[model samples]
Target: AFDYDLFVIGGGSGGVRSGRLAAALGKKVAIAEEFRYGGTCVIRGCVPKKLYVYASQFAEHFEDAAGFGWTVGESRFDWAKLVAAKEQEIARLEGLYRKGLANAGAEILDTRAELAGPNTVKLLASGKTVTAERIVIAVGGHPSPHDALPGHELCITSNEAFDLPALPESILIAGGGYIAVEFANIFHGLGVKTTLIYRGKEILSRFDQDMRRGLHAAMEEKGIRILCEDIIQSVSADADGRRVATTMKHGEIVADQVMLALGRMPNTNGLGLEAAGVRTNELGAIIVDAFSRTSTPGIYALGDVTDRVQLTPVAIHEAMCFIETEYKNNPTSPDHDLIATAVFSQPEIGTVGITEEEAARKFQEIEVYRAEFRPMKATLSGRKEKTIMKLVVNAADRKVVGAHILGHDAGEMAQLLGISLRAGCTKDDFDRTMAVHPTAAEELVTMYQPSYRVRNGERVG
Candidate 1:
């Protein structure tokens, strides 16, 4: 038979976790990684994005330092420094992930792996085929740019934007998703002449309506030129190296660079998935059960490749569940509900659990507790940013069902709040809890009075 009990085809967070845990249990395991270890989060996605957000926000820090009675000198940013540091951090993580797998007695194969048959994988390295009792696919996704327009090659995706040679003087960012808005904020905050184009009524359409409107207003106030309901027709460069982008709203605007933040497609092509009886969607994502099992027996998938929640933590959790259910005989499925996440836009947005719309549709009666105020820190700092926190409590059950926040440090706060919500906390539990004074997070627990109530889950009072 098989040389190992499990064979992992990707070395991302999910794949590494599964391999390490399985090997620790004395099961023979091996993982093949075509690219670097630690996958997208460590290599090119969340980690780098958060670091850039930190760098961009320093512009406000320098301005606010003046109001704290300290005279600050002119501040400048070095894109190269940020890129270099981020690369170092990612490399460190990659080394750790690889070492962890090895320490657990798992074979770390650095090569491309393709399915040879139902129970076999052909390693491209030595032209040898290996068999395993089970297979795990964790290959992630890549940015998908529009392919119809001419001169599309010149337009960079988010992956390239992170390590560009030099920061652009001006940028035209397309799309209305989290990627587009986050990049718009990062570039605009860094003093780039930025134009954000979206073919929709509002940016961040999936967020709460109030948050969407507030963020749109905040971005506009920050001098971000937003063209909603606009589509880019063509992108061409002039002799001066300035790119001319023709859009539906503004006929032509010249900028130093154009970024396509449209979306991403799964990285499952040419893996011989179909040959192994694994089913993939039109976008190339594998269809999997809650336990990370694919349609084919003995094969599984996770992370962005499966097109689930697509967050690193979610993948890790899925890995934990996979081990419990498939290997340990302690069957457990990951609960997809109430998972928290963040978008690193300017005046960042953090959300957990249900959106207002989803809350309305799910519950019979709901109470909304919300507060919008200028943070006390901003008073001494003279920063004009406002913080917004909203709670969606189920009136029938009296439990705090959802929480959303927009401000600095929202992501850190969302993580803990997610744990609280998962632990079956109630609104009264927040009210009874003592809040740390003068902290923006106190607003979450202190919003007692209903900003509005809902009957039949429709906002009324």
Candidate 2:
């Protein structure tokens, strides 16, 4: 007999939310999490990353304060203080999660669980066997590192960058993804000499072409050394510190403390999925349907374990859908069309819906509108940062297809706009709306003139 009606493996965002909801629906649910309760976002991922981003921004904030007639003295950032505060915050969140599970009447097992049968799970803590009517897997992903390189042990991943013993004088980061760019900005802003090496021709290849070029220029202007189309040959630790050697298109380059921010792979190993006949994709991500159901009947998976989008908000939404469909019998599926994302580079970056390139290809005709201006705060602070806002509209239906921003607080601003766009707001709607004066967000609605336009069969705009 089973100990519960539902057994959830992995207490990450999706797993926690789904388990909580299932229990709220009166299902006898039990969740097992081997790692920290708050999962990657709280423990090693978003929370700590955003804290570092905020710390990095304080550098500019202090500099800009000088122009506002404020005499801010030499401010120093203590890494230990930041880490301690972040840990405290994470601990508080973990406590809240535990309370939430308890309030929902869900049992949380601080033990690793492996699938033994379609509805059976083995708890490694006490070697106890339990059976459930349904099972949900919510294991998240981990950073991928280059294992074959010599002295690879000297290299670190994004997970370790959060808790470095001491900030290195000079650091080398290898990758072209958002993680690499975000960390490069964080380190550079913290007064560390940073070098960013990417195997691709341009950084942030997943974003718009113009944004990639613009952010590259901006980062380089801020004293970050960017190497395009480079490959790491080896990494080693010397008497002083770690050293990294890389082969660029032109020549070889070296630096201290190499970080591999290449990508992330799903955490699906050693969970006995094969033993229970659970299916997985080639990337090792558990295969799940739209309703979060895995190939095996009454088995399901969500979040990074499924490798779909991999955003924390998406994971939470997927869990909500799963709870509604499977547990509550009020079938619903999440809409991912207008999902928004933000990158915490020095200037910050926010994006939603399709890219300009994607819209041009998908639609018959597209109109692109953009604006770059100095923010009021920057003006008062005598700072030289430019805020960039863009809108991509489908000319045929006059609907806004994409929105992007590069400036401070872009993430908070993009979130509301994302919902507006998802509610079918159009270019004409934005054009008719009155923008609040003296606000950076106003530029999103006021920029009317086309920066450029692209047709289905035309050349690049």
Candidate 3:
């Protein structure tokens, strides 16, 4: 009846998943991607950034080994070698993605595609038009630097940080989100003098107050200079190609490189949404209903392009929901609440559900259970960092409304805790669980008494 039952544009996680699954469901499907198959997560986002995180952590590992009574030899890092290794791994992963799509019986197009009209798509490379019964857009997003500050063109986004020719002696990073904080730690750990400038009063403004303060303190202890409540007014290059960043408060900061991690904007430009009668918000994100269907019938959008939850797994989850609604004749909507997220900083931060501030305001009576202590390994290494674990409970329901953690492997801990919170587990459920002794995670189940209580929008204890 059509060129395909479904046509998906952008080969990101969401598009690939939808295309592959729909094809496997005995429906004809085709997916087009202009770039690599694996999208942001496998290409330049989570995967490569995490490899850099591991590479950067070696400095601390080498240093901490001495406290464990092990002698270590002198070590030096080769930036080029790390880059090459990352590239090889990324290439392998990209191949696997394409293979998966092909094996699932979906036609893969290695060309850019955009909407020409309702159910119509134009291939940029071949100048050919294709029509489908339905269409999906999953182009994802890119780091945005906001209004091009003076000389902003001279700066680089997170996309370029991966393949730097040489590690800079010093770097200045802007923004206060996870990307900025994570890269600040990564660069600093790799022996670069890193300075973070954020326009907010504190980094990670929406997280639990205790975790935010603890991570900030730990980062500062590790020699990462944080300039809060300030912004870069302009950027300029010196004769030696060094970057000179002028801040609103601090006069000038000269560095070998300047990076902007401000935020991400949906990649919806030049897609001809107008011609197709698809609707988008002021931010240029496609406006979709709960069913991931756009204003125009038979057209859909998901992932970062819709400006929903921006995590990779969330995108995949949305794709699955789309399959149920479109192919299986079963309606489904994406569940966005209680998402577990991690910031892969040096100490790391993992969180789920609402913040304590939100709980206090939303719930008439709330209980906060929190613990701050140096982990066991930190005792041996004499590291001054402290691990923070917290729970916000709804007094009326006794349900754990939020779980926040700051320390090593916090992300792993949050993943399990997310399950509990999503299941509406109560505080007593956590207290009754058996503790795994001699472990940082044991503290989670062992915390019983409330640290404080919030009543009528104020702390009572």
In model 1, how large is the Cα lDDT of residue 35? 83
- Which model scores highest in lDDT? 3
- How many clashes show up per model? 0, 1, 0
Encode model 1's per-residue lDDT on 1-461: one tens digit a residue.
Answer: 78889999888888999999999999999999888988878888888888888888888888888877889878777888888998888989899999999999999989989998978999998888999999888777888857897778889998899889999999999889899999999888788999999988899888887678878888989899999998889999999998999887789999999998888998777889889889888778999878888999989888888877778888899899998989889978885788888888988888888877888889888899989999887878866778889998898888988889898778888889999998989999999989997788888777778899888756783
Model 2 lDDT, residue 379, Cα: 72
Better of 1 and 3 by lDDT: 3
Candidates 1 and 2 compared: the better one by TM-score is 2
- Candidate 2 lDDT, 1-461, residue by residue in tens: 56798999988888899899889878899999997887998888888898898888889888888888899989897888887888899999999998999899999889988989889999999899999998988888899856787877888898889888888778888999889998999989888899999888999998876668778988988789998977877666666665847563645555667888998998888989998888888999998778888889979888988878988888999988888888678987774677889988878888887888898889978889888888888778877678888888998988888888888787887788889888988888887989888788887777677788888736443
Q: 1-461, model 3: which lDDT tens digit per residue?
A: 78999999989899989998998888889999998898999999999999999999999889888899999999999889999999999999999989998898999989989888798899989999999999989889888865669988888888899988899999999989899999999999889999999999999897888877888898998899999999999999999999999988999999999999988998878888889888889998999988899999989898888878789998899999999998789997886688989999979898988989999899999999888898898789887778898889999999999999999898988899999988999999998999887898888787778899999889985
Indicate which candidate wins on TM-score: 3
Q: Residue 276 of candidate 2: its Cα lDDT?
A: 83
Per-candidate TM-scores read 0.95, 0.96, 0.98
For candidate 2, the TM-score is 0.96
Residue range with the least summed lDDT across 10 consecutive positions in model 2: 244-253
Among all windows of ten consecutive residues in candidate 1, which has the lowest summed lDDT? 452-461
